[PDB]
Scaffold this active site. Structure first.
Site, PDB file in Angstrom:
ATOM      1  N   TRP A  14       6.072 -26.017  20.911  1.00 16.62           N
ATOM      2  CA  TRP A  14       6.280 -27.180  21.961  1.00 16.62           C
ATOM      3  C   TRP A  14       8.140 -27.132  21.875  1.00 16.62           C
ATOM      4  CZ3 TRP A  14       2.537 -27.706  18.338  1.00 16.62           C
ATOM      5  CH2 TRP A  14       1.221 -28.348  18.962  1.00 16.62           C
ATOM      6  N   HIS A  56      -5.659 -35.113  10.469  1.00 16.04           N
ATOM      7  CA  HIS A  56      -7.053 -34.856  10.593  1.00 16.04           C
ATOM      8  C   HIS A  56      -7.897 -35.084   9.804  1.00 16.04           C
ATOM      9  CE1 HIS A  56      -7.261 -31.289  13.829  1.00 16.04           C
ATOM     10  NE2 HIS A  56      -6.264 -32.111  13.971  1.00 16.04           N
ATOM     11  N   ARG A  89      -0.623 -31.797  10.006  1.00 19.05           N
ATOM     12  CA  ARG A  89      -1.732 -31.748  10.796  1.00 19.05           C
ATOM     13  C   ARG A  89      -2.887 -31.931   9.886  1.00 19.05           C
ATOM     14  NH1 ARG A  89      -5.337 -27.219  13.557  1.00 19.05           N
ATOM     15  NH2 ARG A  89      -6.191 -28.458  15.384  1.00 19.05           N
TER      16      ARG A  89
HETATM   17  C1  HEM Z   1      -4.346 -36.537  21.504  1.00 16.92           C
HETATM   18  C2  HEM Z   1      -4.342 -36.167  20.195  1.00 16.92           C
HETATM   19  C3  HEM Z   1      -3.925 -34.787  19.705  1.00 16.92           C
HETATM   20  C4  HEM Z   1      -4.290 -33.367  20.133  1.00 16.92           C
HETATM   21  C5  HEM Z   1      -5.327 -33.536  21.437  1.00 16.92           C
HETATM   22  C6  HEM Z   1      -3.616 -32.568  19.618  1.00 16.92           C
HETATM   23  C7  HEM Z   1      -3.911 -31.234  19.731  1.00 16.92           C
HETATM   24  C8  HEM Z   1      -3.481 -30.092  18.837  1.00 16.92           C
HETATM   25  C9  HEM Z   1      -3.421 -28.757  18.977  1.00 16.92           C
HETATM   26  C10 HEM Z   1      -4.444 -28.151  20.137  1.00 16.92           C
HETATM   27  C11 HEM Z   1      -2.764 -28.370  18.033  1.00 16.92           C
HETATM   28  C12 HEM Z   1      -2.842 -26.481  17.887  1.00 16.92           C
HETATM   29  C13 HEM Z   1      -3.498 -26.007  16.819  1.00 16.92           C
HETATM   30  C14 HEM Z   1      -3.567 -24.839  16.592  1.00 16.92           C
HETATM   31  O1  HEM Z   1      -3.720 -24.100  17.542  1.00 16.92           O
HETATM   32  O2  HEM Z   1      -3.430 -24.307  15.298  1.00 16.92           O
HETATM   33  C15 HEM Z   1      -2.148 -29.050  17.557  1.00 16.92           C
HETATM   34  C16 HEM Z   1      -1.207 -28.575  16.284  1.00 16.92           C
HETATM   35  C17 HEM Z   1      -0.323 -29.522  15.605  1.00 16.92           C
HETATM   36  N1  HEM Z   1      -0.487 -31.087  15.688  1.00 16.92           N
HETATM   37 FE1  HEM Z   1      -1.572 -32.256  17.409  1.00 16.92          FE
HETATM   38  N2  HEM Z   1      -2.918 -33.239  18.419  1.00 16.92           N
HETATM   39  C18 HEM Z   1      -2.973 -34.424  18.681  1.00 16.92           C
HETATM   40  C19 HEM Z   1      -2.239 -35.551  17.912  1.00 16.92           C
HETATM   41  C20 HEM Z   1      -1.575 -35.225  16.792  1.00 16.92           C
HETATM   42  C21 HEM Z   1      -0.774 -36.047  16.061  1.00 16.92           C
HETATM   43  C22 HEM Z   1      -0.983 -37.680  16.045  1.00 16.92           C
HETATM   44  C23 HEM Z   1      -0.161 -35.595  15.171  1.00 16.92           C
HETATM   45  C24 HEM Z   1       0.590 -35.932  14.108  1.00 16.92           C
HETATM   46  C25 HEM Z   1       0.694 -37.139  13.554  1.00 16.92           C
HETATM   47  C26 HEM Z   1      -0.239 -34.184  15.505  1.00 16.92           C
HETATM   48  C27 HEM Z   1       0.382 -33.167  14.562  1.00 16.92           C
HETATM   49  C28 HEM Z   1       0.153 -31.651  14.783  1.00 16.92           C
HETATM   50  C29 HEM Z   1       0.908 -30.662  14.128  1.00 16.92           C
HETATM   51  C30 HEM Z   1       1.713 -30.850  13.054  1.00 16.92           C
HETATM   52  C31 HEM Z   1       0.219 -29.349  14.844  1.00 16.92           C
HETATM   53  C32 HEM Z   1       0.765 -28.242  13.955  1.00 16.92           C
HETATM   54  C33 HEM Z   1       0.068 -27.311  12.976  1.00 16.92           C
HETATM   55  C34 HEM Z   1       0.395 -26.064  13.013  1.00 16.92           C
HETATM   56  O3  HEM Z   1       1.707 -25.583  13.382  1.00 16.92           O
HETATM   57  O4  HEM Z   1      -0.626 -25.132  12.485  1.00 16.92           O
HETATM   58  N3  HEM Z   1      -0.982 -34.043  16.428  1.00 16.92           N
HETATM   59  N4  HEM Z   1      -2.498 -30.351  17.947  1.00 16.92           N
END
Ligand code: HEM
Ligand SMILES: [Mn+2]
EC number: 1.11.1.5
Length: 291
Positions: free
Chosen positions: A188, A49, A45
């Site tokens: 998820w 970002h 993530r």
């Molecule tokens: C429309 C685009 C996206 C939205 C709205 C979105 C939204 C989110 C949200 C709301 C979380 C939860 C964060 C938390 O509460 O700690 C999250 C986690 C995460 N996202 Fe996304 N995301 C997007 C695109 C992506 C893409 C493109 C990737 C990867 C290339 C990605 C990889 C991850 C990963 C790895 C986590 C987990 C990190 C953790 O467990 O702390 N996301 N995202």
């Protein structure tokens, strides 16, 4: 605005493999993190970002400048929940001071995907730290409470098409949402420290119900205890996205190939590589090195 990749002085594949190794070994060292999710998902993530601030229309933001190290970006509300990932990489930067911030942050994501049994992701060096006044303003990262039209138009700014978007979102196999970070709650999928196509399978095969969570946001929940963001769920609401979700759910190898390509592209957006720049590196996993 042009950003030309500049190789760290006298550094080659073997130097970067050692940085990869340091990251990968620390992943093992801290594998207890978040009840044994480990740091892998957070590093993925983080890499996304720091890359996702790019605007293709004027080449502002992007990974090149390593601007996440500056407080304006580090304190972006959208980056809540990444601070520990940043801190994880800090001692590694001190250990290899010669690597640029952008190279280190992006390499962190590559290392994490590979060490979680994901695809090999070719990686290029040469990002160069730029000053604090080059830090992009907050607000460039995407909102989760949106639909397919939003997702599609958002990712146009990152030069991503439908396949690239659906492939990239598959990283949500990893990790989880936390109310205190994003206002969403839950994973998820089950195996959320392993890089697989589980995101697509769960999207298609679970029964989803729209519910309000404790932060007053709405999310899609299953009785298995999984969740989907509205932006995740939009991938099966939109007919073109749906087709691709089906493809990746059926063929993990294809998902892997498309994800590798899209993730490298994401991490390299905004960067001009000289014609005589080194070819992309493909690092060996700890396992492949018997380490
Ligand atoms: C429309 C685009 C996206 C939205 C709205 C979105 C939204 C989110 C949200 C709301 C979380 C939860 C964060 C938390 O509460 O700690 C999250 C986690 C995460 N996202 Fe996304 N995301 C997007 C695109 C992506 C893409 C493109 C990737 C990867 C290339 C990605 C990889 C991850 C990963 C790895 C986590 C987990 C990190 C953790 O467990 O702390 N996301 N995202
Ligand atoms: Mn987390």
């Amino acid at each position: 605005l042009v950003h030309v990749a500049s190789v760290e002085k006298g550094r080659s594949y073997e130097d970067f493999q050692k940085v990869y190794n340091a990251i990968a070994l620390k992943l093992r060292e801290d594998d207890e993190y978040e009840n044994y999710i480990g740091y892998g998902p957070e590093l993925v993530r983080l890499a996304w970002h720091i890359s996702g601030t790019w605007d293709k229309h004027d080449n502002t933001g992007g990974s090149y400048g390593g601007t996440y190290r500056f407080k304006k970006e580090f304190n972006d509300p959208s980056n809540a929940g990444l601070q520990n990932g940043f801190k994880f990489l800090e001692p590694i930067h001190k250990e290899f001071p010669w690597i640029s911030s952008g190279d280190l942050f992006s390499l962190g994501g590559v290392t994490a995907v590979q060490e979680m049994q994901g695809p090999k992701i070719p990686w290029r060096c040469g990002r160069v730290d730029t000053p604090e006044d080059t830090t992009p303003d907050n607000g460039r990262l995407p909102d989760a409470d949106k639909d397919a039209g939003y997702v599609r138009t958002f990712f146009q700014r990152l030069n991503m098409n439908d396949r690239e978007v659906v492939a990239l979102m598959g990283a949500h196999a990893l990790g989880k949402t936390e109310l205190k970070n994003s206002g969403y709650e839950g994973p998820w999928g089950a195996a959320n420290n392993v890089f697989t196509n589980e995101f697509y399978l769960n999207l298609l095969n679970e029964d989803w119900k729209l519910e309000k969570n404790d932060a007053n946001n709405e999310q899609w929940d299953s009785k298995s205890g999984y969740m989907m963001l509205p932006t995740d769920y939009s991938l099966i609401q939109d007919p073109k996205y749906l087709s691709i979700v089906k493809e990746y759910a059926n063929d993990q190898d294809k998902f892997f190939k498309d994800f590798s390509k899209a993730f490298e592209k994401l991490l390299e957006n905004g960067i001009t590589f000289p014609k005589d720049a080194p070819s992309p590196f493909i690092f060996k996993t700890l396992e492949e090195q018997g380490l």
